[PDB]
Amino acid sequence: LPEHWTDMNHQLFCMVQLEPGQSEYNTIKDKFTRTCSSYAIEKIERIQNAFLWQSYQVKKRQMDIKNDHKNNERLLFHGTDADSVPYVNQHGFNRSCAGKNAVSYGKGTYFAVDASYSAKDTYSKPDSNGRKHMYVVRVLTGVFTKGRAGLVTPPPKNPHNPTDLFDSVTNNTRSPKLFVVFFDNQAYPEYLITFTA
Amino acid sequence: LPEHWTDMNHQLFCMVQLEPGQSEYNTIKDKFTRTCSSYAIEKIERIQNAFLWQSYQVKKRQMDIKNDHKNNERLLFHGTDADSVPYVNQHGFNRSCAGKNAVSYGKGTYFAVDASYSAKDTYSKPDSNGRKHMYVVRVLTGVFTKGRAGLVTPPPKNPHNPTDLFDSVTNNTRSPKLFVVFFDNQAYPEYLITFTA
Numbered sequence: 214l215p216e217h218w219t220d221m222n223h224q225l226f227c228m229v230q231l232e233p234g235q236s237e238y239n240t241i242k243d244k245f246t247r248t249c250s251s252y253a254i255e256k257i258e259r260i261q262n263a264f265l266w267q268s269y270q271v272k273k274r275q276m277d278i279k280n281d282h283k284n285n286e287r288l289l290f291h292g293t294d295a296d297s298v299p300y301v302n303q304h305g306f307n308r309s310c311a312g313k314n315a316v317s318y319g320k321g322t323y324f325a326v327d328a329s330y331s332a333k334d335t336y337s338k339p340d341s342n343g344r345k346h347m348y349v350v351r352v353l354t355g356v357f358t359k360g361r362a363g364l365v366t367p368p369p370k371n372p373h374n375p376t377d378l379f380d381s382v383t384n385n386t387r388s389p390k391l392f393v394v395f396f397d398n399q400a401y402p403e404y405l406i407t408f409t410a
Numbered sequence: 411l412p413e414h415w416t417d418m419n420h421q422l423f424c425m426v427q428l429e430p431g432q433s434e435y436n437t438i439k440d441k442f443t444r445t446c447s448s449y450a451i452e453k454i455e456r457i458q459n460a461f462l463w464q465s466y467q468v469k470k471r472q473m474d475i476k477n478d479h480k481n482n483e484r485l486l487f488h489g490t491d492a493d494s495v496p497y498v499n500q501h502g503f504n505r506s507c508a509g510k511n512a513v514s515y516g517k518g519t520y521f522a523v524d525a526s527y528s529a530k531d532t533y534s535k536p537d538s539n540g541r542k543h544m545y546v547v548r549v550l551t552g553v554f555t556k557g558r559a560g561l562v563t564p565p566p567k568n569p570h571n572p573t574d575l576f577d578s579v580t581n582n583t584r585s586p587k588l589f590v591v592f593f594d595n596q597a598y599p600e601y602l603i604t605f606t607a
């Protein structure tokens with residue numbers, strides 16, 4: 214487990230409230246405010262989930278071996294409803310629970326490049342207290358191609374070798390604004406931003 | 411990587427045909443003929459998939475910690491069509507693939523206690539030549555409960571803590587004949603039996 218995590222005292226899961234003025238808080242606030250300067254952050258929690266971390270780090274090492282010295286990992290955003298937060302914190306992103314996106318590039322879990330996209334009420338639905346929830350997520354985007362609405366897995370790189378897959382798909386390979394992943398443990402929910410108008 | 415695997419010349423995937431009449435072949439054959447003695451076995455292959463094995467073993471160690479005992483694994487059967495075999499050998503079982511058979515106990519991957527159940531033509535579909543395909547699968551069934559139609563994950567053990575889930579579901583808790591799992595890397599395809607009626 215990473216050495217800068219708080220001691221969890223044999224526990225397997227903890228949310229750690231960050232302090233404004235720490236580089237760790239300030240980098241996430243800045244990444245968010247870059248496209249959502251109209252909203253205000255209530256708090257930023259670091260998600261310490263030992264099992265999700267272990268399974269994700271195994272998938273990352275495998276994709277680092279399989280791919281040719283790629284940057285396989287991106288830090289992306291995911292807006293969701295309050296009712297989903299306890300499940301995501303504990304169990305991560307389940308494609309079987311994902312909504313149809315208004316532009317579908319496949320049946321999987323969607324992640325945004327820009328906080329502004331995730332900040333829409335469609336994704337980060339305001340709870341009964343007007344709190345919106347957005348995860349900051351390590352995603353194994355790996356080698357990607359433009360997706361299509363029919364996909365239940367990423368497409369093959371080569372139609373004559375149908376099992377050798379792209380790692381993820383995007384809306385546009387030149388100017389990616391979203392990624393879709395189709396496997397468990399391809400995404401680590403690292404931070405939860407709680408925010409308001 | 412387990413002792414009984416054979417050398418892979420630094421490769422990460424191999425299908426290894428078992429030698430008839432040796433101890434490993436005999437063991438797997440006996441599990442099949444216990445309920446399928448009227449069938450003809452053409453061959454048995456050991457599936458040596460390093461990445462699938464690693465991801466599965468990580469989930470096993472996690473479930474052994476969580477359940478506080480090491481009785482979490484069962485050896486079960488899975489019949490499928492010839493066209494799904496390459497995908498299962500490389501990627502394992504995927505709840506998102508199944509646009510085919512019934513899902514009465516939930517939208518997960520189905521496994522049989524008896525080879526005779528998996529030997530049905532609706533699962534192990536005969537190809538042009540009457541060849542049928544069935545996997546022998548290590549499944550992390552863990553603590554299980556009765557399933558029902560529409561489940562996307564196992565139910566919670568107590569709805570007072572709705573994120574602490576059962577590991578799998580079954581048709582019948584007292585005398586199970588099938589198990590359903592809802593997460594990637596909860597099942598390792600260990601052997602592929604090629605056979606005919």
Ligand SMILES: NC(=O)c1ccc(Oc2cccc(C(N)=O)c2)cc1
Pocket residue numbers: 487488489490511512513514515520521522527528529533588589
């Ligand atoms: N009662 C049901 O509706 C039912 C659903 C799926 C079933 O599928 C299975 C069960 C066990 C194994 C296999 C298989 N693919 O080998 C398929 C069987 C019964």
